[PDB]
Structure 1
């Protein structure tokens, strides 16, 4: 017996259309293109988590030595140093201590130099 596609397709779509918002023109008002925009969307969505991990860590490092070099070292040097002192093992946050607590960072800085030369 006859079995339409009634109400079953509308839904399916609005499901997508709706995912689309700040999607410029057609990419948000028309299905077809709306949806299609949403495959490349996949490409990005995914490959972006695996990724922002690389990115952020890059913002971290950049500071960790724009503070390190702020006394006379350098991420490179400043870091093998704390490493020298198995005692030190932050890496994570370490940068922040560079961004807000100048006092501390000072400590760790010189702390390394004296685990160096």
Structure 2
């Protein structure tokens, strides 16, 4: 019973090869350095799922505020508005709707304003 080391090695190797193709470095060819790169990239990707979520909620609120500024006052007010007011929803990026069709926004603005007043 001889167990030749066969093709298995080069098979899985060409797998990882396919994965890491596109990189720079000798890691764009080196079946070893490539792998290490993949590790890194995978972790980076996960952390960046959660991250990306933060990134966007951020951008959202940035814009939201910009709009609320150009109308009457500042963000924190406005939001304590909706939060208190009534509209117990909005989806912060569906506030970023505000960037398109300012009308409905401004309506919500004066709503949150006249709310806690």
Output the TM-score relative to the length of structure 2: 0.91
Q: Given that residues 65 and 75 in structure 1 are in contact (C-alpha distance below 8 angstroms), is that contact kept between their aligned partners in structure 2?
A: yes
Is 35-44 or 84-93 further displaced after alignment? 84-93
Distance in structure 1 (CA, Å) of the matches to 2:79 and 2:56: 18
Superposition map of 1:1-117 within 5 A: 1-117=1-117
How big is each residue's C-alpha offset from its partner over 1:23-47, in whole Å with a ceiling of 9 and x where there is no partner? Answer: 0131211101011111111221211
The 3 A distance-change label for structure 1 pair 73 and 94 is farther
Compute the RMSD of aligned alpha carbons. 1.4
Is 18-27 or 84-93 further displaced after alignment? 84-93
Q: Given that residues 61 and 93 in structure 2 are in contact (C-alpha distance below 8 angstroms), is that contact kept between their aligned partners in structure 1?
A: no
Unmatched runs of 5 consecutive residues or more in structure 2: none
Distance in structure 2 (CA, Å) of the matches to 1:14 and 1:101: 52
How big is each residue's C-alpha offset from its partner over 1:54-111, in whole Å with a ceiling of 9 and x where there is no partner? Answer: 1110011001110000112222111110112233411344323211011111100111
SS of equivalent to 2:3: coil
Q: Given that residues 64 and 94 in structure 1 are in contact (C-alpha distance below 8 angstroms), is that contact kept between their aligned partners in structure 2?
A: no
Output the TM-score relative to the length of structure 1: 0.91
Q: Given that residues 68 and 75 in structure 1 are in contact (C-alpha distance below 8 angstroms), is that contact kept between their aligned partners in structure 2?
A: yes
Higher helix share: 2
Q: What count of residue pairs does the alignment treat as equivalent?
A: 117
